[PDB]
Scaffold this active site. Structure first.
Site, PDB file in Angstrom:
ATOM      1  N   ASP A   1       0.922  -1.142   0.000  1.00  0.00           N
ATOM      2  CA  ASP A   1       0.000   0.000   0.000  1.00  0.00           C
ATOM      3  C   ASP A   1       0.970   1.200   0.000  1.00  0.00           C
ATOM      4  O   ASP A   1       2.195   1.032  -0.204  1.00  0.00           O
ATOM      5  CB  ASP A   1      -0.909   0.023   1.244  1.00  0.00           C
ATOM      6  CG  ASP A   1      -0.144  -0.228   2.561  1.00  0.00           C
ATOM      7  OD1 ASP A   1       1.129  -0.151   2.608  1.00  0.00           O
ATOM      8  OD2 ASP A   1      -0.849  -0.514   3.578  1.00  0.00           O
TER       9      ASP A   1
ATOM     10  N   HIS B   1      -9.578 -20.056  18.362  1.00  0.00           N
ATOM     11  CA  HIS B   1     -11.006 -19.747  18.611  1.00  0.00           C
ATOM     12  C   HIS B   1     -11.715 -20.977  19.257  1.00  0.00           C
ATOM     13  O   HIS B   1     -12.957 -21.046  19.335  1.00  0.00           O
ATOM     14  CB  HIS B   1     -11.707 -19.267  17.317  1.00  0.00           C
ATOM     15  CG  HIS B   1     -10.912 -18.255  16.537  1.00  0.00           C
ATOM     16  ND1 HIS B   1     -10.882 -16.912  16.862  1.00  0.00           N
ATOM     17  CD2 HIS B   1     -10.101 -18.398  15.458  1.00  0.00           C
ATOM     18  CE1 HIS B   1     -10.093 -16.272  16.016  1.00  0.00           C
ATOM     19  NE2 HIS B   1      -9.607 -17.151  15.153  1.00  0.00           N
TER      20      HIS B   1
ATOM     21  N   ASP C   1       5.632   2.541   1.748  1.00  0.00           N
ATOM     22  CA  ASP C   1       6.689   1.514   1.501  1.00  0.00           C
ATOM     23  C   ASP C   1       7.791   2.008   0.537  1.00  0.00           C
ATOM     24  O   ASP C   1       8.105   3.189   0.510  1.00  0.00           O
ATOM     25  CB  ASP C   1       6.095   0.187   0.962  1.00  0.00           C
ATOM     26  CG  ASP C   1       4.688  -0.159   1.559  1.00  0.00           C
ATOM     27  OD1 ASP C   1       4.425   0.208   2.753  1.00  0.00           O
ATOM     28  OD2 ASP C   1       3.873  -0.792   0.802  1.00  0.00           O
TER      29      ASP C   1
ATOM     30  N   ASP D   1       1.229   3.868   2.712  1.00  0.00           N
ATOM     31  CA  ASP D   1       1.834   4.487   3.920  1.00  0.00           C
ATOM     32  C   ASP D   1       3.300   4.704   3.639  1.00  0.00           C
ATOM     33  O   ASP D   1       4.085   4.929   4.551  1.00  0.00           O
ATOM     34  CB  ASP D   1       1.678   3.648   5.210  1.00  0.00           C
ATOM     35  CG  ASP D   1       2.010   2.162   5.036  1.00  0.00           C
ATOM     36  OD1 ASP D   1       1.749   1.386   6.007  1.00  0.00           O
ATOM     37  OD2 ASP D   1       2.512   1.742   3.962  1.00  0.00           O
TER      38      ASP D   1
HETATM   39 MG    MG Z   1      -2.312  -2.397   3.636  1.00  0.00          MG
HETATM   40 MG    MG Z   2       2.295  -0.518   4.081  1.00  0.00          MG
END
Ligand code: MG
Ligand code: MG
Ligand code: ZN
Ligand code: ZN
Ligand code: ZN
Lengths: 43, 196, 133, 114, 49, 267, 98, 783, 165, 65, 85
Positions: free
Chosen positions: H145, H749, H149, H147
């Site tokens: 994504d 779980h 990288d 943020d």
């Molecule tokens: Mg992500």
């Molecule tokens: Mg990321």
RNA sequence: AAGACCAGGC
């Protein structure tokens, strides 16, 4: 600067887990992700 | 990032003429995307940014002090008498057309922070250059005009691919590649190559 | 060319199930006993009350691209209040004779039931639906 | 530092001419024009005008990458009526509205006090 | 604003970091592991001040 | 009033033009708003030559600072753009030059304004490069401050540009714009909990239209027609002119298209 | 019904760097840990005297801005008096896909 | 392990990635200053010498340019200095180090590179800005994504290093992936979220927009399609214009829940030749799901024709959304007055439930659940009465969500957000936990210094009464705090642990590649699998096909496959076959439909004893259903006019197919006997889809079309055989190691009961691989 | 436990059954018990299954247990990949773990084995037990920096023959 | 840091008002909002221009050299 | 010594991804270097796209030597390998 | 140069 002046270190049971007793003495949230998370503490 | 750990590069930049615009004719210094909300579960951010609507407006104090009795219902009730849609929303207009946006938007003032790591102190690229003396490999670091480690784990996924010719070159002519003289009897590097 | 089906139905249910423009509609035909119609109408163009006398018709023309109408000379086949365009997508045997057809006007669905669409409804990528009154 | 030039949003850097017209080979009698150094300010406006002309079958503009000044017009019209003339009239029409809007506005402004 | 609390060692500021360790001179009991000769151990880390 | 798009001025001032704008196409009112923002040219300082800056601010900080200062652009028409004018670098045909010298004489702080900018270049008797002062006291925009022995010696060189270029240049501010308050054309769908009418606030412009009422089947044929604005000047150009020139710059660069068809038409 | 002591104000359990979080009690509990690492990664005035010190790296905000949303703990932290951050106007839309 | 196997390298870049929704799938927004530094050493050939003498003159300063010009008797000519960068008298035979430029083979990596799909060829698109751009939908496999990288790119310096880059690893021919016999890139985020919006029944577009979207699709044949609505105001359905992105002859059908070919939910999905007939598009279609659109379009049409498909879907959807908007407000987590009320009294009732069991455990009447403590059964009794309570509260907000709810809407696309989020945020947060138990008694005989000692109650022990929109209490906050770190801890511990697991796997399998006799081997040439995967098949060309003969009654099977010409009642009605009437009676044929129908019991017997659970849905090569529709669509068959094939055509031709489906070719019995074996399953499916009653009855194939079905299958099958060379070792390791990284809550779980606990997740996987002679949870299950 | 079972009429029915579940393992002792079906009994200890029912029964159980880690997790990997692991851990004889006490102690290529763990004593005893090296392992060919016998490099290329047109 | 000329968000010159602001708070004793009224900031992105502003310059001058 | 007769050849008679990838490349090498060309270059002036054109027509004069694990091998020309894949 | 440590990024 304020934060680094209030740092903590612990070398080497459950020493990273935020322990019940930390309440009011260490920050519940401040600590670095991964490498040395939970060991380094900020008051 | 905002103050509830919403790490975000920047991506693209529009001039005020293209940007969605409220009916009052305001413009967001920042668009971020509804997808960075419900999985991360950061509800304070949808608060603070509502909260600071009533800050900007009444010239008042932003009491986001933790364990008080300040409520979302609260904030809003104030906003609703203060001139707006009490949950944030404002019918913005698309920029290019000025055709009303079918959704309305939570339009916030929200303390954001500008972090270290701007793109331009890491934009490394090398095609050869300086070279360690021991191993004849690319010196390290982005500020030695180094080169990237093509580590073994990277290797595996060339082998998986079955890319053989590449993985070779990308390990010789992209790196170490050397020429020595071997014994035809014993097989070591003795051969005193008195070349020329 | 030329029609393929004609009948006048009585609307016996208007379900607005969690949609805002569109609607599922339930109808029986005034004349014809074992006949029934289920259809998606665009209520925000044509309001469909309970018990109206919707007149249903299926043409198949009056081929290339589309052109803005346009009534400069154009006259397409309508004294019609309301007109959609579909595809047949499965023909179904509901025992003995009682056949049923399935049409899509881009996701607006239509289920219809009788036995005399034989020399009329052959497996087509055609079909225009037309309503009036 | 890999930032483009700021003015390349309206200066046609040598070579680049302003309008390039090329024949659409998809559907008979239709063309695709490229407006170097322009956008939605201009595109959207012409495109909407081409829409009141009953002689135009089809009309659309699209900003391919917003890095770049350019935007593309695709115009289709009825046999006999050359695509460019559509642009020509919908262009002149724009002007004749704008030109009039201005003087309408002015006789208004010229009334107000304060 | 600069609140002190560091040093200055060749013009480079330095913060001493609190080091953490288990206290001495308190007595503690530890049920030792399940495959081992010893059941429980009591421990006192003794140091003078 | 005549043939085409109609205008009605609700409120007017040296600062704000409030108007309906009836019987225009959507695509147009917008393309206006847009040129208004980005494309009507104006003078602003583009070049600082700093000689002394013993101030507590950085050089290129203050550069950026005068970058923003609204210089008088009422005669912007007779100034060429530097990029065009055949003069090496700059002259009085394409640029206004300014001067700022200040010094802390007082033990007390020595404030520094735009009222403080002094011109130099031959204005050739036209309206150009007066720093606009909308301030009550007569000194707008507070550039920097000086302690005591402090000194700032510089030489701004304002040139003609446009918003697209840098925003120092746009004359436009905030432009309020809106079409159809009751949402008659259903171009939007209102988010809610309870009752959209009690939950959103009737637009200011609601008195200038009809009820939904109430009732009647949605009007499908009805198009995006009639718009509400209130344009706000930054100072450089008169409010009234901002529209006028907006409307014009649009017309002017639609015309450049037309013209540009005539040329490539040769062969 | 047998108290001996009483907390000063609960808010106090928090560090230095987590006390900038505006409603951390409405946030989910890692996140705050994250902010807590980024508060530090920020730019702004770090010292009212940079024009005079001489160190590798400084990074200062052309216009910093005490936020519109504060925590009583900020005051003793000196935050409104030395911010890093600006009250950016903010859109939560999918726009252009960028 | 550090400078030989392998190394630091030349001809590379790094930067911050940035998402580019107007870029191609298989492209790579590359910064111009990078492309100003890396250099493919090009030979000089009369095919290039023009665009190359050009390409010198621009020097290393203008984009399309060049430094150093290599000659014979190898000699560098540095083109930023040198009294000759302006002159320059080229030759065929010389090299020129041109700048990397538009449309080029690059290898675009991202760490940690635990995949063949963390590597890929992208095409080079030189751009402004110090950044790499990429299509959002190459996000999944890279696991990026933005943020911010940061990613790599290596430039091949050879002609066959770039052939081998692009004929082998290029982004499209990577879409559908061995790992999970399904495709590893889908539609995501805005695209995925508004595609749902655009596609609703309610969504209509009118001319203006319809023509820009149309024009916005790049392979659009300039044929405005006829609108669904021509009545007052020609309007199009969202569904409609979208289909203009979906290619020709693309057939696909689903049925989610109560789906009736009249989809009264507008759920399911039915796409009939590149046009959608009903059903809200979302994740299960255009996701990276199994039976989805990309799986089809790839296998079916091309990789290219599919990679092109990626872009189009976006270009439209994005555009539609650019002018629709989507937001998410805090108003999006407010419930009814009634519903907050009733939610809180949900907890209240289940509060005095826990309170009453506590009061029972106190009069010593709590009975010992067999096999557990008195205490420990209480831990079960509560955490159960407490989750029970939070999920109920949670799904009570989910009922109360309006359909226009920004959260509920991403949840419905499946773009971000699940059940627990809504739960959390609006309803109650729930019980906190560390070490699988509720909150430790950390201070002697209580949790926090603020309650009395010996407090077993929920709020003492660490339940969080509140929502996130509600706010949290001081204690409640802390306990949250505590469950918090625990996660953050093992996320640090997991990614390290699993990071080593993979390193061992990869080094333990490595050279297990399939050799040129289809046998999986290694450096010593040990046999491991005599026939790769047990069936000689590549895992990309494989799909969950349903085995038609396993389920159903014997009665229901009978009437499905039985053909009895000697019975007047069980013949093929002469309406079906053209010979039909002339077939009735007849021994010579009945002996063939007989031994056909015996062969098909031997089958149902044989499968029911392999797949002993009835599970009839197994991954298998050559999707037959798609070949059938593809046949009855290509060939335009009317479902009243009688077919034209003999029983001999079908039966005798299906047995003819099965001969040609070669995996192994050796001309001796031993080999031919594993050949008979690798195919055994497939041919079950064959005989079950290509049986006389069926071919005739169900999908009414004509001789001409049938021979085509028979033809594709052979060719499709043969294309599915795993390629000798394939490095199946590494393939296998990373195919296990990669999910291992994505393993959540490494507890379980199973901790609803206080010892139904069984070590599962990464700790188990560590034991298994280590062969752990002392595991934590040994257990017998006895029958 | 639920369990699907052929009906006396054809289709598969839900027939539920009582299943006994344990904490601890003694295999060769509880299958010999009366009352219990000794043909379906199962234990998560694949180390015991290996010893009691032979290697092939082990190979199968190991898989069940590997696949169980995955499919409990939400994921689904393809049978071929897991089975391929499972088979390596098996074709040796019993259960060779994936650690330096498993595959790495086997007699692959000296050079390829050294690149994993214990880089030195691996190369040491290799000079001591003077071992010839195949150079057929990926890793060996990497080290020496030649093209692996891998995909692209599994075959060779030569010219014709025919020659010319 | 010195009050910005022009609001980041709309473009309206706010710089000439820092002067008139501090004065309206101290001598007239008004509250932040009603003083932002009187100064002609109605679009609150401009209200945020001023209310968020910290005037650190005042400390930098404080340093003698 | 040794090979395998042109008759009794087991191996996939098809050409694998990995085979062609290297074929094209090896051709695309000789082409990029000025060695002569065996098809009417129809506009195409790139070595790799040319190889693809020569590959489609089967006028590439090259022979795969497939090694079996016993060591012996089978030869296949690029003229005689099916290029479905 | 290059070793060591510390902060830190996905
Ligand atoms: Mg992500
Ligand atoms: Mg990321
Ligand atoms: Zn020797
Ligand atoms: Zn000049
Ligand atoms: Zn503003």
């Amino acid at each position: 600067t304020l934060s680094h002046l209030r740092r903590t270190n612990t070398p080497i049971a459950k020493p990273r887990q935020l322990h019940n007793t930390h309440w009011g003495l260490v920050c519940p949230a401040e600590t670095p992700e991964g490498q040395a998370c939970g060991l380094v503490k900020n008051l | 990032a905002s103050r509830h750990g919403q790490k975000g590069t920047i991506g693209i930049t529009y001039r005020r003429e293209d940007m969605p615009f409220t009916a009052e004719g305001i413009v967001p210094d920042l668009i971020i995307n509804p997808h960075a909300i419900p999985s991360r579960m950061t509800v304070a951010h949808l608060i603070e940014c509502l909260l600071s609507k009533v800050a900007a407006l009444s010239g008042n104090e932003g009491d986001a002090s933790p364990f008080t009795d300040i409520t979302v219902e609260g904030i809003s009730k104030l906003l609703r008498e203060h001139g707006y849609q009490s949950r944030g929303f404002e019918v913005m207009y698309n920029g290019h057309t000025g055709k009303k946006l079918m959704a309305q938007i939570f339009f916030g003032p929200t303390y954001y922070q500008r972090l270290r790591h701007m793109v331009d102190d890491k934009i490394h690229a090398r095609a050869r250059g300086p070279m360690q003396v021991l191993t004849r490999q690319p010196v390290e670091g982005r500020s030695r005009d180094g080169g990237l480690r093509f580590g073994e784990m990277e290797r595996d996924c060339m082998i998986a691919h079955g890319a053989a010719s590449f993985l070779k070159e990308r390990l010789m002519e992209a790196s170490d590649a050397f020429r020595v003289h071997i014994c035809g009897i014993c097989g070591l590097m003795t051969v005193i190559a008195k070349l020329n | 060319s030329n029609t393929l089906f004609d009948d006048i139905f009585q609307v016996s249910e208007v379900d607005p199930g969690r949609y805002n423009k569109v609607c599922r509609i339930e109808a029986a035909s005034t004349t014809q006993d074992q006949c029934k119609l289920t259809l998606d109408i665009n209520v925000e163009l044509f309001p469909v009350a309970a018990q109206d006398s919707l007149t249903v018709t299926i043409a198949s023309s009056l081929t290339r691209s589309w052109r803005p109408p346009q009534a400069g000379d154009r006259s397409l086949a309508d004294d019609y209040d309301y007109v959609m365009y579909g595809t047949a997508y499965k023909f179904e045997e509901v025992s003995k004779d009682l056949i049923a057809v399935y049409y899509s006007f881009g996701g607006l669905l239509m289920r219809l039931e009788g036995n005399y669409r034989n020399l009329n409804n052959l497996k087509q990528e055609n079909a225009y639906l037309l309503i009036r009154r | 530092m890999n930032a483009p030039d700021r003015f390349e949003l309206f200066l046609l850097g040598e070579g680049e001419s302003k309008l390039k017209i090329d024949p659409d080979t998809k559907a008979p009698n239709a063309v695709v024009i490229t407006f170097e150094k322009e956008d939605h300010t201009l595109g959207n406006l012409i495109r909407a005008e081409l829409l009141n002309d009953r002689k135009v079958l089809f009309a659309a503009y699209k900003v391919e990458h917003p890095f770049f000044a350019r935007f593309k017009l695709r115009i289709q019209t009825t046999e006999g009526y050359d695509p460019k003339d559509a642009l020509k009239n919908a262009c002149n029409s724009i002007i004749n509205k704008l030109g009039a809007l201005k003087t309408n506005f002015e006789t208004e402004w010229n009334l107000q006090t304060l | 604003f600069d609140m002190g609390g560091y040093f200055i060692i060749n013009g480079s500021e330095k913060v001493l970091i609190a080091q953490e360790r288990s206290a001495g001179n308190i007595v503690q009991v530890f049920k030792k592991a399940a495959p081992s000769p010893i059941s429980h151990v009591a421990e006192i880390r003794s140091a003078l001040e | 009033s005549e043939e085409g798009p109609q205008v009605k001025i609700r409120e007017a001032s040296k600062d704000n033009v409030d108007f309906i704008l009836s019987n225009v196409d959507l695509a147009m009112a917008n393309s206006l708003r847009r040129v208004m923002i980005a494309e009507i040219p104006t003078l602003a300082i583009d070049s600082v030559e700093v000689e002394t800056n013993t101030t507590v601010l950085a050089d290129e900080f203050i550069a950026h600072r005068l970058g923003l200062i609204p210089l008088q652009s009422m005669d912007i028409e007779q100034l060429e753009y530097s990029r065009d004018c055949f003069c090496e670098d700059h002259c009085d045909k394409c640029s206004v030059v300014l001067t700022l010298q200040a010094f802390g004489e007082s033990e007390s702080t020595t404030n520094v304004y735009s009222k403080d900018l002094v011109i130099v270049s031959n204005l050739m008797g036209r309206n150009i490069g007066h720093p606009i002062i909308q301030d009550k006291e007569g000194n707008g925009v507070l550039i920097c401050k000086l302690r005591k022995g402090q000194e700032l010696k510089l030489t701004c060189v304002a040139k003609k540009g446009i918003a697209k270029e840098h925003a120092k240049w746009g004359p436009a501010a905030a432009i309020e714009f809106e079409y159809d308050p009751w949402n008659k054309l259903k171009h939007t769908d209102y988010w809610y909990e309870q009752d959209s009418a009690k939950e959103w606030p009737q637009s200011k412009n609601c008195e200038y239209e009809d009820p939904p009422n109430e009732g009647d089947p949605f009007d499908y044929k009805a198009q995006a027609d009639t718009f509400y604005m209130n344009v706000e000047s930054v100072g450089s150009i008169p409010v009234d002119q901002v529209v006028v020139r907006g409307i014009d710059t649009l017309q002017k660069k639609v015309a450049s298209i037309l013209l540009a068809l005539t040329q490539m038409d040769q062969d | 019904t047998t108290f001996t002591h009483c907390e000063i104000h609960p808010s106090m359990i928090l560090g230095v760097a987590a006390s900038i979080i505006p409603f951390p009690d409405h946030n989910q509990s890692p996140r705050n840990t994250y902010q807590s690492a980024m508060g530090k990664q920020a730019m702004g005035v770090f010292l009212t005297n940079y024009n005079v010190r001489m160190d590798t790296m400084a990074n200062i905000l052309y216009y910093p801005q005490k936020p519109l949303g504060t925590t009583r703990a900020m005051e003793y932290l000196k935050f409104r008096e030395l911010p890093a951050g600006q009250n950016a106007i903010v859109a939560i839309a999918c726009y252009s896909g960028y | 392990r550090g400078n030989l196997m392998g190394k630091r390298v030349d001809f590379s870049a790094r930067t911050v990635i940035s998402g580019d929704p107007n870029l191609e799938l298989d492209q790579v927004g590359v910064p111009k200053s990078i492309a100003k530094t890396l250099t493919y050493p090009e030979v000089v050939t009369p095919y290039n010498i023009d665009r190359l003498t050009q390409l010198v003159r621009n020097g290393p300063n203008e984009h399309p340019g060049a430094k150093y010009v290599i000659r014979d008797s190898g000699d560098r000519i540095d083109l930023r200095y040198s009294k000759r960068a302006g002159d320059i008298q080229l030759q065929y035979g010389w090299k020129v180090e041109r700048h990397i430029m538009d449309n080029d083979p690059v290898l675009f990596n991202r760490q940690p590179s635990l995949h063949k799909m963390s590597m890929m060829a992208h095409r080079v698109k030189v751009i402004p800005y110090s950044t790499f751009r990429l299509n959002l939908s190459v996000t999944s496999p890279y696991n990026a994504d933005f943020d911010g990288d940061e990613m790599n790119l290596h430039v091949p310096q050879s002609e066959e290093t770039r052939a081998e880059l692009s004929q082998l690893c290029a982004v499209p021919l990577q879409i559908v992936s061995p790992q999970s016999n399904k495709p590893c890139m889908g539609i995501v985020q805005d695209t995925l979220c508004g595609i749902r919006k655009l596609t609703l029944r309610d969504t209509f577009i009118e001319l203006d927009q319809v023509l820009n979207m149309l024009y916005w699709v790049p392979d659009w044949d300039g044929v405005i399609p006829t609108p669904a609505i021509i009545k007052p105001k020609p309007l199009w359905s969202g569904k409609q214009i979208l289909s203009v992105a979906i290619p020709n002859g693309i057939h696909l059908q689903r049925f989610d829940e109560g789906t009736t070919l009249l989809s009264p939910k507008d759920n399911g999905m039915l796409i009939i030749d590149g046009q959608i007939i009903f059903g809200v598009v979302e994740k299960k279609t255009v996701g990276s799901s199994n039976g989805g659109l990309i799986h089809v379009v790839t296998r079916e049409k091309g990789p290219q024709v599919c990679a092109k498909l990626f872009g189009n879907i976006q270009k439209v959807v994005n555009f539609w959304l650019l002018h629709n908007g989507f937001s998410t407000g805090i108003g999006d987590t407010i419930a009814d007055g009634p519903t907050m009320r009733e939610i809180t009294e949900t907890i209240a009732e289940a509060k005095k439930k826990v309170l009453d069991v506590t009061k029972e455990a106190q009069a010593n009447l709590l009975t010992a659940k067999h096999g557990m403590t008195l205490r420990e059964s209480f831990e079960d009794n509560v955490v159960r009465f407490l989750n029970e309570a939070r999920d109920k509260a949670g799904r009570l907000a989910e009922v109360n969500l309006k359909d226009l709810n920004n959260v509920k809407q991403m949840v419905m696309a499946g773009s971000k957000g699940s059940f627990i989020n809504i739960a959390q945020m609006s309803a109650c947060v729930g019980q906190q936990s560390v070490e699988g138990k509720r909150i430790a008694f950390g201070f002697v005989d209580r949790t926090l210094p603020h309650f009395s000692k010996d407090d077993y109650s929920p709020e003492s022990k660490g339940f969080v009464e509140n929502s996130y929109l509600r706010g949290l209490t001081p204690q409640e906050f802390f306990f949250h705090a505590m469950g918090g770190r625990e996660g953050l801890i093992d996320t640090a511990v997991k990614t390290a642990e699993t990071g080593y697991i993979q390193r061992r796997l990869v080094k333990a399998l490595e050279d297990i590649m399939v050799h040129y006799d289809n046998t999986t081997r290694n450096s010593l040439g040990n046999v491991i699998q005599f026939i790769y995967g047990e069936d000689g098949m590549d895992a990309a060309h494989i799909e969950k096909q349903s085995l038609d003969t396993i389920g159903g009654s014997d009665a229901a099977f009978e009437k499905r496959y039985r053909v009895d010409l000697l019975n007047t009642d069980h013949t093929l009605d002469p309406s079906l076959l053209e010979s039909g009437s002339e077939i009735l009676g007849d021994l010579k044929l009945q002996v063939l439909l007989d031994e056909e129908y015996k062969q098909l019991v031997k089958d149902r017997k044989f499968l029911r004893e392999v797949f002993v659970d009835g599970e009839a849905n197994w991954p298998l090569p050559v999707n037959i259903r798609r070949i059938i529709q593809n046949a009855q669509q290509t060939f335009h068959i009317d479902h009243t006019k009688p077919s034209d094939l003999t029983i001999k055509d079908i039966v005798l031709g299906v047995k003819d197919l099965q001969e040609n489906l070669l995996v192994l070719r050796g001309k001796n019995e031993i080999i031919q006997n594993a050949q008979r074996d690798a195919v055994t399953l497939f041919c079950c499916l064959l005989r079950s889809r290509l049986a006389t009653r069926r071919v005739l009855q169900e999908y009414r194939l004509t001789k001409q079309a049938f021979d085509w079905v028979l033809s594709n299958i052979e060719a499709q099958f043969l294309r599915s055989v795993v390629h000798p060379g394939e490095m199946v070792g590494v393939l296998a390791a990373q195919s296990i190691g990669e999910p291992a990284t994505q393993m959540t809550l490494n507890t379980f779980h199973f901790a609803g009961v206080a010892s139904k606990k069984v070590t599962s997740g990464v700790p188990r996987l560590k034991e298994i691989l280590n062969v752990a002679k002392n595991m934590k949870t040994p257990s017998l299950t006895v029958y | 436990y639920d369990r699907k079972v052929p009906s006396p009429t054809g289709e598969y029915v839900k027939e539920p059954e009582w299943v006994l579940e344990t904490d601890g393992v003694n295999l060769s002792e509880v299958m010999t018990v009366p009352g219990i079906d000794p043909t379906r009994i199962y234990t998560n200890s694949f180390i015991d299954i290996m010893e009691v029912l032979g290697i092939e029964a082990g190979r199968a159980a190991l898989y069940k247990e590997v696949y169980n880690v995955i499919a409990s997790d939400g994921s689904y990997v393809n049978y071929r990949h897991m089975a391929l692991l499972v088979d390596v851990m098996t074709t040796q004889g019993g259960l060779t773990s994936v650690t330096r006490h498993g595959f790495n102690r086997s007699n692959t290529g000296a050079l390829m084995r050294c690149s994993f763990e214990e880089t030195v004593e691996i190369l040491f005893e290799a000079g001591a037990s003077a071992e010839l090296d195949d150079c057929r392992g990926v890793s060996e060919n990497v080290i020496l920096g030649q093209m692996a016998p891998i995909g692209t490099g599994a075959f060779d290329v030569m010219i014709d023959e025919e020659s010319l047109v | 840091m010195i009050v910005p000329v022009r609001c980041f968000s709309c473009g309206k010159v706010v710089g000439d008002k820092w002067e008139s602001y501090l004065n309206l708070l101290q001598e007239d004793e008004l509250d932040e909002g009603t003083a932002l009224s009187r100064l002609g900031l109605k679009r609150y992105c401009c209200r945020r221009m001023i209310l968020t502003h910290v005037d650190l310059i005042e400390k930098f001058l404080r340093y003698n050299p | 010594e040794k090979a395998i007769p042109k008759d009794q050849r087991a191996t996939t008679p098809y050409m694998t991804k990995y085979e062609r990838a290297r074929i094209l490349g090896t051709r695309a090498l000789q082409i990029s270097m000025n060695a002569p060309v065996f098809v009417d270059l129809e506009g195409e002036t790139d070595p790799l796209r040319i190889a693809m054109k020569e590959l489609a027509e089967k006028k590439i004069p090259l022979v795969i030597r497939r090694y079996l694990p016993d060591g012996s091998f089978e030869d296949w020309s690029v003229e005689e390998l099916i290029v479905d894949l």
